[PDB]
Amino acid sequence: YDLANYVASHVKDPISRINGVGTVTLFGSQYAMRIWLDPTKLTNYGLTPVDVTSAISAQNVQIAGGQLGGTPAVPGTVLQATITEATLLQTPEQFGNILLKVNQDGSQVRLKDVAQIGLGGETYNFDTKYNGQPTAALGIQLATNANALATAKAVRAKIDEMSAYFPHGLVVKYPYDTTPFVRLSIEEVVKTLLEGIVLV
Amino acid sequence: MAKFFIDRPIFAWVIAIILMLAGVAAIFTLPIAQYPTIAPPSIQITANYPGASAKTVEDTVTQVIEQQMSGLDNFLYMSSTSDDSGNATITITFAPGTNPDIAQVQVQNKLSLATPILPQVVQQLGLSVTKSSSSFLLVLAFNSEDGSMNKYDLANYVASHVKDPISRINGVGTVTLFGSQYAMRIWLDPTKLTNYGLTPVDVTSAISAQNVQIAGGQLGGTPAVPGTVLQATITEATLLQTPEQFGNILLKVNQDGSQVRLKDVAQIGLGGETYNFDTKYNGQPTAALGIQLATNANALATAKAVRAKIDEMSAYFPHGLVVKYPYDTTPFVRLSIEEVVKTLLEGIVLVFLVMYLFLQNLRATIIPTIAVPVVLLGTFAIMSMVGFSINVLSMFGLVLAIGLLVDDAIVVVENVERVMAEEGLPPKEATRKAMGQITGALVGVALVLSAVFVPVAFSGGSVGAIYRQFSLTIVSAMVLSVLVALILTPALCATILKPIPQFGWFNRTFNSSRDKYHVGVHHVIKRSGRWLIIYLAVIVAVGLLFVRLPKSFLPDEDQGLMFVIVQTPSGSTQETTARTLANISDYLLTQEKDIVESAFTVNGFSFAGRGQNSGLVFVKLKDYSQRQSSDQKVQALIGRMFGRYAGYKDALVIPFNPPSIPELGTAAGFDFELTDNAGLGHDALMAARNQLLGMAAKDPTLRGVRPNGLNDTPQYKVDIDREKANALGVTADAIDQTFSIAWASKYVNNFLDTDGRIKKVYVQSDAPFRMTPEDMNIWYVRNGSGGMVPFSAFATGHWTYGSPKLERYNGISAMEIQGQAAPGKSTGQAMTAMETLAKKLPTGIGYSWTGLSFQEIQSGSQAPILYAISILVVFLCLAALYESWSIPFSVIMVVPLGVIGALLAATLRGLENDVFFQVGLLTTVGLSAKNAILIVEFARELQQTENMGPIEAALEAARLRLRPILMTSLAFILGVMPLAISNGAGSASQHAIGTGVIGGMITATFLAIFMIPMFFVKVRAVFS
Amino acid sequence: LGMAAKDPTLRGVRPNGLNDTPQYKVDIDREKANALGVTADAIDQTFSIAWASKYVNNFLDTDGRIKKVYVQSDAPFRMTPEDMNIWYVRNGSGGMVPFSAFATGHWTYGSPKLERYNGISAMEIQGQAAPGKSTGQAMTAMETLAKKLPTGIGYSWTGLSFQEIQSGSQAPILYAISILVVFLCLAALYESWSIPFSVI
Amino acid sequence: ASAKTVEDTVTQVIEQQMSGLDNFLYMSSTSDDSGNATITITFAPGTNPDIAQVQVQNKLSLATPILPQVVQQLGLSVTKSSSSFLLVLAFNSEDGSMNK
Amino acid sequence: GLLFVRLPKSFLPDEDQGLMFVIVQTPSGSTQETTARTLANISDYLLTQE
Amino acid sequence: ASAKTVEDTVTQVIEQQMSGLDNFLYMSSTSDDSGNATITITFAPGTNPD
Ligand SMILES: CCCCCCCCCCCO[C@@H]1O[C@H](CO)[C@@H](O[C@H]2O[C@H](CO)[C@@H](O)[C@H](O)[C@H]2O)[C@H](O)[C@H]1O
Ligand SMILES: CCCCCCCCCCCO[C@@H]1O[C@H](CO)[C@@H](O[C@H]2O[C@H](CO)[C@@H](O)[C@H](O)[C@H]2O)[C@H](O)[C@H]1O
Ligand SMILES: CCCCCCCCCCCO[C@@H]1O[C@H](CO)[C@@H](O[C@H]2O[C@H](CO)[C@@H](O)[C@H](O)[C@H]2O)[C@H](O)[C@H]1O
């Protein structure tokens, strides 16, 4: 999940913007805030999953606050500043404290009490290995009528640029790449051309 | 070719006629614009999130759109901001050459795919995709002189009556209304809400429910029962239209039967969609309308047409309404066109007078005066075919090009006259003999000069965009001129000129002079080594003058405008900043009453974004003819404004003359993007910004290094104790929505105004209840069991810091730093200094180059490579001409001659090494190469047909070429002289070109006539 | 149109638009409805679903093709104004109140479609040249009749008519340019100003 | 929307944004009591219709923040039009086994 | 000169393509049943008398 | 969602609108239990991808 997240958060979007890159596939994703419900615990508090989805949507929010002294203000107002009310939650701990119920004895039920919260994948569809070790994979598909050698060289350059900010231990390999083949075959026919010149 | 058309003047005149006709057609169909497009296409998306903070916009709007912006062909980079006016702006920049239509549609389609993810309010308000431009044809100010209309009335009027007719004027491109218009404003009163137990969401929902347009189907609709004999569309429910109807919306009914209505709980009425800004004309309310020119229309007719339609429909403006034109560039382009036509006609008269002076033969003078107009008209015809426009850059191209095409005309006719007189032959044989001595050299001249000019045409970037219209107009004219010298003018000479049968002081003085010159040519030859040391002295002077002469793109003209940036201290309001702007307008209209025509003020805007603490003043000056003197020019007004407002505590006031082409910025400038590459956060990035800026302000390689955006500013946080509220039975949604509607306002739905137009509906608290943090406690929200709870029950607030403007580059948070290279230092070395500073920043902070520094990085080793190609092909063309690997050196060495003169003239007049200087220098170096090419050509032909030695050949060829060289230089210096001594609009550019070329022609021709034969004999001695 | 009916030059002149049609407005007395316990939304939605129909969602037909689901009143109940009485809406207490209790009918007349040509309100007319007349002669007759219309009513030609005007008015200029070009071509070919003239 | 509502709030707005179109010849538009707006932009003969379409769409972006929210959300459709009613197929059930 | 100016002008001739249109427009407010009946009138004439 | 849900609620909905395309060559769609609808439309060679 960490490798898929790093790639999603630092490599994929800029690579997706290189000319000639038609499309980009991450077998993985950026982190997703993951809320794993427990039905027996939901039953205990008289709650359903919809209660949970609704509370996330009401308590995980960014709210327009307008302004102190904002416009149109009463004549004479001489101070203004933006108001911040509610913000997106950020860590699984904050989500675990979302409020679900006020039960009879005065306690309030919270999402931590009905679910496991953590960062994981948007999808659990994939599993990738490079030489049997964990990997995060980016499939680069060439845009229609774009030049494979040009695009591959540009993306390899952008990756070389981004390598300056890799976390410790992060390595990049190129498991599948057809442009070395095309480049080497053009190179080889050039070599035969010059051999034939000498022979003539 | 030449000998072909000599024997047949009819065919040559048919070709001349076709060129002339096509040229006239191009005169009347070519586009007119002040400048060609320069900068690469950029597409910007804008979004509005009413009441959202910069952080809210970055997280709910900007980041979503950016994450969706991919698969765009030819993307160079992307740059976005998110600010406290609730505004998102994302600009995508594409590579030079990209089709702007395709970039825009590609951007719009990715944006359409992105739209569902965005906040519902952002979606409902609509996003904009537009091509980023910095230029306008006209900007109209619709003003209420008697106060009958405020800015909302004015903008409403424009949108209802002007924008549509104006859009249908031929040649009008984009039409922008700077101005907000009517909206139904519901101003909630919290106490009246609490008394009836209502919340702002009740109001929004009632509006959503009662201001509706309902499809009624139709009577007798299909499928119908048999026998029905009438259809009719049925209308049920229509949008509310008037404040009374909105106030009569039913909100609640009490048990006693009484009804609670919106009028009982809020103030309802027409207001503006936004109050973020205010615009004033000369202290009057105003609404502005920007008219941008359609692609490939002519600016002059479009502007005349717009002013004519505005005049036409001003017959029906309500009382008190007037239209002013605070912005208009078109007088100045009309003036450039008049000035160029004046120069071209003068150039024709000058060739007439010079041919007569040296030849005193009317018949021979008329040939160049036919040939030059034909080539100019053909140049217009070629410009039409190639897609150029009539613009200041191309017009200066024609101005510089007469020096080449009159030189061709004089070479042809003067050489025919010399052969016809000194050798005594009749016209057909004389022209055949004279055009057999120059045809190959003329072909070679065309190729060599084209080579001279290709490093300019093939230059990349916006600077190359400046160059190429200019240089390629020169190249078109030159190539046609060579064709005309080989097609029309030999036939004109062979048919027009007659034999010569049987002032005088001037003839005697020129003959004495050319004898002293001939002896001087010999002197320099015999003293070669001394004058080769002198040649190296000239080269060293070229270097030192070049390094000392300031860099520049275009000279800054007084175009009758001045822009004033106004930045008041943080937290300032619209009311407070309005008074710095009001001060400035009153000052301009009273103290500068005789200099200033308009002062247009907008607060709410800098050039770099919005803010209540920021404004602009747009001031137009009086007609250039009523503005004589040095005190009355814009530069002096900028000085007086620095004086008045540098000692001004309330605001930062920057007066400045707008640059001609703003996209170029400053030649010494650099544009840097400091980026958060490790997800380290805003605080870390600004810590790095401040660290880097502190280093740069100590750096002698750098000057003026400033952070392009804003420092963090204090903000007020509302903390809701959600569990305390829930214990009270109050749900988080009720709290946040009540607070947000009251403070940030809310867009509910559309309504149909009494004029039949669709407008927006907003509910927000009335201003008295949302001004202060205390007001946050006067607001109520209901709990799950009914009844009202105050915000004071569960809400506290506290002050903090946050950015009011959040910048992103290529999708990751950034902060743009902008500066200049230190005087005497280059931009590349400035970039290296910045980079070594950036290396010394904490790990995870990266950076990118943007703008003209990015352009410089992309094309780095292009300039030297193009020069090598140019030099090589010049050399190869000359080897073919001379059949020698060494003789071309006697021509190529002419280059620094004349360059020294241009540098000398510019430095002694304080002008700068700008683009005008550079193109002028290229044409004069081209002419010196041509003069050297013909000197060496005749020296060669004499050395091989009359078996002469190198010195005899050099001396005789110098005698032969002295007259035509002097004829051309005299005509050309006199032709550009009026530009080099100019009063009035555009004189800075006219000076920038004229000073340089006069200096160049002077030293070029004198040093060339004395040193080129010495070089010829020297190369002949050295490699033979 | 009345003028064209008598102009012997032309036949079949008809408007390409639509005459004003009778229209029926339904006025809801929202105060009565609020007093009787129905919200404006309920009456709005019932009358639209009943008369205008509603596309609710898709269904999957027996052939495997996705198609639409529509809800509307059966024809006998939505045919005449007199029908609008039978529709009931249930109020906030669960009781039913009929439309006749709070709504009124109103006849009027109005346009079924508005035309704009280059932004100017307009009405399109098409016609034929009478047997024995050309398209151009019919257009001259049309301009003669339009000349006799009230001041402020102008006209334009579009489509075939516009292209016809281009053809007819450009031909003489093209003949002139063609004569000039033949003149210059023979002047060049035969090195004479007298040969091309004697030919022209 | 009524015919007048459509014309004044949809059709006119869309037309206003159509300044600056390369090779514009004229434009004609309809606004019906069915709520329908149809604006047909005709260009010079020989104009590239694909370029014309991309330009019309790029100009249409300007209209969306002015258009009624519902119209802007529901979507505007842009197409290369024709009246070349080329051929019409009539499908008939001769044995009567199928109706309209 | 006079023979050119006198000559009636046109764009293209009306060729018989083997096809013809008949446009029918009934009073405003009329129903699908009413227009179906006029279209049938035209179809009956064309398919019996013509 | 299942491949069948994907086909009924997305793939058939999009396909029913893929008409009026210049240089249409063929179309190939797939709906799978990973919730993915992929509709590839191929045009004649030389069709402008833009
Ligand atoms: C209604 C009032 C009368 C009409 C107003 C006239 C409007 C059109 C005139 C030119 C507008 O062109 C606009 O000018 C300003 C100053 O050159 C440029 O601004 C430039 O310099 C300023 C400060 O030097 C920086 O804030 C900014 O990074 C840079 O873009 C801006 O990039 C260009 O977009
Ligand atoms: C006579 C017939 C000649 C053919 C027609 C062309 C006319 C003028 C010739 C100019 C050759 O074109 C010129 O090529 C050079 C070398 O690639 C380019 O330079 C580019 O490539 C080199 C490496 O490939 C880089 O080092 C350099 O930073 C980059 O800008 C330059 O931007 C372009 O302008
Ligand atoms: C391959 C290259 C190397 C070989 C160089 C050969 C020439 C060098 C001769 C001396 C140079 O300096 C000077 O040359 C010129 C040549 O006109 C002569 O003087 C004179 O000669 C001719 C007479 O025909 C006069 O017309 C001319 O005004 C005058 O210069 C003289 O002989 C010598 O005083």
DSSP state of E12: S
Residue (of A126, A151, A101) closest to A29 by Cα position: A126
- Distance CA(B327)–CA(B3), nearest Å, equals 56
Chain centroid offset of residue C102 CA: 36
Is B134 within 8 Å of B281 (Cβ atoms)?
A: no
Q: Do E30 and B229 touch (CB under 8 A)?
A: yes
Which are the contacts of D89, defined by CB distance < 8 A and separation ≥ 6?
A: none
Is B199 within 8 Å of B739 (Cβ atoms)?
A: no
Residue (of B7, B16, B10) closest to C197 by Cα position: B10
Nearest ligand by distance to the CA of B959: 3
Phi, psi of C46 (to 5 degrees): -60, -45
Q: How far is the CA of B964 from the centre of ligand 3 (A)?
A: 25
Question: Cβ–Cβ contacts within 10 Å for residue A119, how many?
Answer: 14
Is B384 within 8 Å of B481 (Cβ atoms)?
A: no
Residue type, B83: D
Q: After which residues is chain A broken (C to N over 2.5 A)?
A: none
Question: Cβ–Cβ contacts within 10 Å for residue F20, how many?
Answer: 8
- Distance CA(A119)–CA(A122), nearest Å, equals 9
CA distances from B537 to B532, B545, B1006, B1009, B1012 (A): 8, 12, 16, 18, 16
Q: 3-class secondary structure for C87-148?
A: CEEECCCCCEEEHHHCEEEEEEEECCEEEEECCEEECCEEEEECCCCCHHHHHHHHHHHHHC
| CA atoms within 13 Å, Cβ hemisphere of A6 | 16
- Distance CA(D64)–CA(D14), nearest Å, equals 9
What sign does the dihedral B450-B451-B453-B454 (CA atoms) show? positive
CA distances from B680 to B102, B688, B845, C71 (A): 36, 11, 8, 56
Chain centroid offset of residue B213 CA: 46
Which tokens hold the place of B329?
Answer: 């560039």
| CA atoms within 13 Å, Cβ hemisphere of A65 | 29
The beta strands (E) that lie in chain D are given as: 24-32, 37-43
Which tokens hold the place of B39?
Answer: 């900068």
In chain D, % helix, strand, coil (3-state, to 5) comes to 35, 15, 50
Question: Cβ–Cβ contacts within 10 Å for residue B586, how many?
Answer: 14
CA distances from B503 to B506, B507, B960, B966, C68 (A): 5, 6, 21, 17, 100
Rama region for B72: left / alpha / beta (φ>0; ψ in -120 to 50; rest): beta
Helix and strand element counts for chain D (H, E): 4, 2
Residue (of B992, B762, B906) closest to B200 by Cα position: B762
- Pairing between strand B182-188 and B266-272? antiparallel
Which tokens hold the place of A6?
Answer: 């790093």
CA distances from B530 to B887, B950, B1018, C24 (A): 21, 19, 13, 106
Q: After which residues is chain B broken (C to N over 2.5 A)?
A: 502
Q: Which helix (H) or strand (E) holds C70?
A: strand C66-71
Which are the contacts of B980, defined by CB distance < 8 A and separation ≥ 6?
A: B990, B991, B994, B995, B997, B998
Residue (of B677, D44, B306) closest to A6 by Cα position: B677
Residue of F nearest to D78 (CA): F20
Cα angle vertex B53, ends B51, B54, to 5°? 135
Is B532 within 8 Å of B1018 (Cβ atoms)?
A: yes
The beta strands (E) that lie in B228-385 are given as: 232-237, 250-253, 259-261, 266-272, 278-280, 286-293, 321-328
CA distances from B455 to B39, B503, B872, B930, C123 (A): 19, 45, 12, 18, 59
Query: For residues B12, B18, B24 and B28, what is the CA-based torsion angle, rounded to 10 degrees?
Result: -160
CA distances from B3 to B10, B14, B479, B938 (A): 14, 17, 19, 19
Any CB–CB contact under 8 A between D33 and chain C? Answer: yes
CA distances from D56 to D39, D40, D44, D51 (A): 11, 10, 14, 9
Question: Which of B515, B522, B952 has most ligand 3 atoms within 8 Å of CB, for mutation?
Answer: B952
Of B224, B227, B232, nearest to E32 by CB-CB distance is: B224
- Distance CA(D19)–CA(B170), nearest Å, equals 8
Is B877 within 8 Å of B451 (Cβ atoms)?
A: yes
Is B327 within 8 Å of B598 (Cβ atoms)?
A: no
What sign does the dihedral B230-B231-B237-B239 (CA atoms) show? negative
Q: Which helix (H) or strand (E) holds B732?
A: helix B732-744
DSSP state of E33: H
Return the exposure string of C82-106: e unless at least 16 CB atoms fall within 10 Å of the residue's CB, then b.
ebbeebebebeeeeebebeebbeee
Q: Do E9 and C168 touch (CB under 8 A)?
A: yes
Which tokens hold the place of B352?
Answer: 């007439």
- Distance CA(B333)–CA(B989), nearest Å, equals 13
Residue (of B410, B436, B482) closest to B4 by Cα position: B436
Q: Do D20 and B172 touch (CB under 8 A)?
A: yes
**Which ligand 3 atom sits nearest the alpha carbon of residue B526?**
12
- Pairing between strand C21-28 and B232-237? parallel
- Distance CA(B587)–CA(B576), nearest Å, equals 17
Q: Which helix (H) or strand (E) holds D52?
A: helix D49-60
Q: Do E30 and B222 touch (CB under 8 A)?
A: no
Q: How far is the CA of B853 from the centre of ligand 1 (A)?
A: 20
Place of tokens 């304080």: B910
Helix and strand element counts for chain F (H, E): 2, 2
Q: 3-class secondary structure for B324-340?
A: EEEEECHHHHHHHHHHH
Indicate the length of chain D as a whole number: 100
What sign does the dihedral B481-B487-B490-B493 (CA atoms) show? negative
- Enter the resolution in angstroms: 2.9
Chain B positions in Cβ-Cβ contact with residue D20 (cut-off 8 Å): 172-174, 292, 294-295
Any CB–CB contact under 8 A between C6 and chain D? Answer: no
Q: Which helix (H) or strand (E) holds B144?
A: strand B138-144
Which tokens hold the place of A161?
Answer: 């640029």
DSSP state of B550: P
Burial (CB < 10 A; 0-12, 13-18, 19+), residue C63, is: exposed
Place of tokens 């586009």: B31
* Cis omega (within 30 of 0) for bond into A14: no
Which tokens hold the place of C124?
Answer: 């399109």
Chain centroid offset of residue B537 CA: 41
Rama region for B898: left / alpha / beta (φ>0; ψ in -120 to 50; rest): left
Name the experiment that determined this structure: X-ray
Q: 3-class secondary structure for A116-167?
A: EEEEEECCCCCCCEECCEECCCEEEEECCCCCHHHHHHHHHHHHHHHHHHCC
Which tokens hold the place of C130?
Answer: 């009478």
- Distance CA(B913)–CA(B993), nearest Å, equals 10
DSSP assignment of B745-809: -EEEEEEE-TTS-EEEEEEEE-GGGSSSGGGGGG-EEE-TTSSEEEHHHHEEEEEEEE-SEEEEE
Indicate the length of chain F as a whole number: 50
**Which ligand 2 atom sits nearest the alpha carbon of residue B865?**
15
Residue (of B558, B729, B518) closest to B639 by Cα position: B558
| CA atoms within 13 Å, Cβ hemisphere of B709 | 25
Which are the contacts of D1, defined by CB distance < 8 A and separation ≥ 6?
A: B213, D9, D10, D35, D68
Which are the contacts of B734, defined by CB distance < 8 A and separation ≥ 6?
A: B199, B201, B781, B782
3-class secondary structure, B934: helix
- Pairing between strand B780-782 and B788-790? antiparallel
Which tokens hold the place of C82?
Answer: 């007199």
Q: Do F9 and C65 touch (CB under 8 A)?
A: no
Place of tokens 């000239």: B538
Put simply, the chain F residues between 12 and 31 with a CB less than 8 A from any chain C CB are 12-13, 16
Which are the contacts of B975, defined by CB distance < 8 A and separation ≥ 6?
A: B343, B346, B347, B350, B402, B403, B406
* d(CA E46, nearest CA chain B) in Å: 26
Which are the contacts of B371, defined by CB distance < 8 A and separation ≥ 6?
A: B405, B408, B409, B412, B484, B485, B488, B489, B492
- Pairing between strand A81-84 and B713-720? parallel
Is D61 within 8 Å of B129 (Cβ atoms)?
A: yes
3-class secondary structure, B10: helix
- Distance CA(B210)–CA(B240), nearest Å, equals 8
- Distance CA(B967)–CA(B722), nearest Å, equals 92
Give the closest residue (by CA) to ligand 3 atom 26: B952
Question: Cβ–Cβ contacts within 10 Å for residue B1011, how many?
Answer: 25
- What's the maximum distance between 2 C-alpha atoms anywhere in chain D? 57
- H-state helical runs in B946-986: 950-980
Is B909 within 8 Å of B901 (Cβ atoms)?
A: no
- Distance CA(B258)–CA(B254), nearest Å, equals 6
- Distance CA(C38)–CA(C30), nearest Å, equals 9
- Distance CA(A161)–CA(A150), nearest Å, equals 16
Cα angle vertex A102, ends A99, A107, to 5°? 95
- Pairing between strand F24-31 and F37-43? antiparallel
Which are the contacts of A76, defined by CB distance < 8 A and separation ≥ 6?
A: B575
Q: Do chains E and F touch (3 or more CB pairs under 8 A)?
A: no
- Distance CA(A88)–CA(A94), nearest Å, equals 10
CA distances from A29 to A8, B499, B738, B975 (A): 6, 91, 36, 70
Cα angle vertex B629, ends B627, B632, to 5°? 55
Cα angle vertex B227, ends B221, B231, to 5°? 30
Give the closest residue (by CA) to ligand 3 atom 12: B526
- Pairing between strand B812-821 and B702-707? antiparallel
- Distance CA(B37)–CA(B192), nearest Å, equals 58
F28 - beta bridge partners? F40
Chain F positions in Cβ-Cβ contact with residue C58 (cut-off 8 Å): 8-9, 13
Rama region for B704: left / alpha / beta (φ>0; ψ in -120 to 50; rest): left
Question: Which of B453, B463, B865 has most ligand 2 atoms within 8 Å of CB, for mutation?
Answer: B865
Chains that touch E (3 or more CB pairs under 8 A): B, C
Residue type, B430: A
CATH number reported for the structural domain that contains residue A45 in this entry: 3.30.2090.10
Contacts 24+ apart (CB under 8 A), B528-536: B528/B1014, B528/B1017, B528/B1018, B531/B1010, B531/B1011, B531/B1014, B532/B1018, B535/B893, B535/B896, B535/B1011
* d(CA B291, nearest CA chain D) in Å: 10
3-class secondary structure, B409: helix
Contacts 24+ apart (CB under 8 A), A147-152: A147/A20, A148/A178, A148/A179, A148/A182, A149/A179, A149/A182, A149/A183, A150/A20, A151/A18, A151/A19, A151/A20, A151/A21, A152/A177, A152/A179
Burial (CB < 10 A; 0-12, 13-18, 19+), residue B883, is: exposed
- Distance CA(B179)–CA(B164), nearest Å, equals 16
Residue (of B681, B711, B673) closest to B844 by Cα position: B681
- H-state helical runs in chain A: 2-10, 12-16, 39-44, 49-59, 92-96, 148-162, 179-199
For residue A89, the enclosing domain spans 33-121
Which are the contacts of B706, defined by CB distance < 8 A and separation ≥ 6?
A: B693, B817, B818, B819
Residue (of B198, B84, B118, B249) closest to B742 by Cα position: B198
| Ligand 1 environment, Cβ below 6 A | B 134, 136, 139, 141, 288, 326-327, 563, 600, 607-608, 618, 658-659, 662
Residue type, B547: V
* Cis omega (within 30 of 0) for bond into D68: no
Is B776 within 8 Å of B817 (Cβ atoms)?
A: no
